[PDB]
Amino acid sequence: STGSATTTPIDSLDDAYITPVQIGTPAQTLNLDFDTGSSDLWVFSSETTASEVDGQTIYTPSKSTTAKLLSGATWSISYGDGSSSSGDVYTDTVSVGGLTVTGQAVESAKKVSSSFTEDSTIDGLLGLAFSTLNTVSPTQQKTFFDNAKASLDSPVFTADLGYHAPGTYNFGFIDTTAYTGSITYTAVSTKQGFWEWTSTGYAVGSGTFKSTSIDGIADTGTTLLYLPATVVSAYWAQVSGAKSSSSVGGYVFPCSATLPSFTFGVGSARIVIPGDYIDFGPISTGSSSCFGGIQSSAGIGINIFGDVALKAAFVVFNGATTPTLGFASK
Numbered sequence: 001s002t003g004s005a006t007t008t009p010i011d012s013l014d015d016a017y018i019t020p021v022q023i024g025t026p027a028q029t030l031n032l033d034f035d036t037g038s039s040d041l042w043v044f045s046s047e048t049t050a051s052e053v054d055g056q057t058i059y060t061p062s063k064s065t066t067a068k069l070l071s072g073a074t075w076s077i078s079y080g081d082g083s084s085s086s087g088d089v090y091t092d093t094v095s096v097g098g099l100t101v102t103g104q105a106v107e108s109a110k111k112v113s114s115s116f117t118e119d120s121t122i123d124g125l126l127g128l129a130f131s132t133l134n135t136v137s138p139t140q141q142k143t144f145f146d147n148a149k150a151s152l153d154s155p156v157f158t159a160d161l162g163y164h165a166p167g168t169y170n171f172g173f174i175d176t177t178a179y180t181g182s183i184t185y186t187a188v189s190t191k192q193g194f195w196e197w198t199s200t201g202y203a204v205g206s207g208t209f210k211s212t213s214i215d216g217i218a219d220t221g222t223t224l225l226y227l228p229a230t231v232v233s234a235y236w237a238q239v240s241g242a243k244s245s246s247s248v249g250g251y252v253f254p255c256s257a258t259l260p261s262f263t264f265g266v267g268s269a270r271i272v273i274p275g276d277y278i279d280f281g282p283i284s285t286g287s288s289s290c291f292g293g294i295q296s297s298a299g300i301g302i303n304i305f306g307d308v309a310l311k312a313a314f315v316v317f318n319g320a321t322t323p324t325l326g327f328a329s330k
């Protein structure tokens, strides 16, 4: 079987993408953030503290005839930006774009951090990293992808994120009309639970390509591109008036500047990120300083190929027994 769902940016800056997901019987439709950097499916629910809910659609297990409480199970997660949530665990039927999984662990949030409460358009997260990172205790739970793998025509899903436009998550098949040229596959390390791979280098604008190994993770759940300080410094040195601002927390640049493109290597192939993709707009309303989409990973400890990079490509997440990542131009 296969599934296909449209994913839509939540705002004009492509800060995140939401995808409708049907949970329960009868279906309750929630808009979830598909996150290849985590492995928990958690949702705002009728059990969430009422003061921590501001406009989200909530999952109500008591209205689902297929929901079962997973006796004694709890979950607690903390994200790399400081966000967190926790609660109890149900099992229920979950469908994405026509692809149905029965008995999926649905983690019901009793408490959410402030950053989720303020994001009225995100009803939860759907983790698509490896199941070793799932936080359910005492019995670890499988991701939606892991549960669907058996029945999929092919054990893959693909991410086709749009620039200021809707995109597509496909499960079980590779749409050969969605990209140009060939797909270049590269090896994945699963030792930390992430879709971790090694980029073969980079170039700034029309500059020379610098062959150098950059280990990082493919993370649809992270907005920006986080790279080593040496790389990020070489990029922003080409932007007149750009500087690192401690008060803002990263590189900013004059909103009137035009940004160079950024190229990253995948094996022998090259993925080009247009300079417009790196503009994340004024740091405050009316400001003439704009926030950069390429930032240093020094404070984070891991390099992150977030949405800024992934939306420049067609990305195949190949969950075969030897997993690989595929990149193609589009």
Ligand SMILES: NCc1ccc(C(F)(F)F)cc1
Residues within 6 Å of the ligand: 035, 036, 037, 038, 079, 080, 081, 219, 220, 221, 222, 300, 302
């Ligand atoms: N998108 C989920 C996520 C969040 C944070 C991290 C970090 F910061 F720990 F690398 C990885 C993945």
Ligand SMILES: NCc1ccc(C(F)(F)F)cc1
Residues within 6 Å of the ligand: 016, 033, 035, 037, 079, 080, 081, 083, 115, 116, 119, 122, 221, 222
């Ligand atoms: N990387 C996971 C993640 C995704 C979204 C959010 C936000 F924006 F909703 F707070 C935080 C963390």
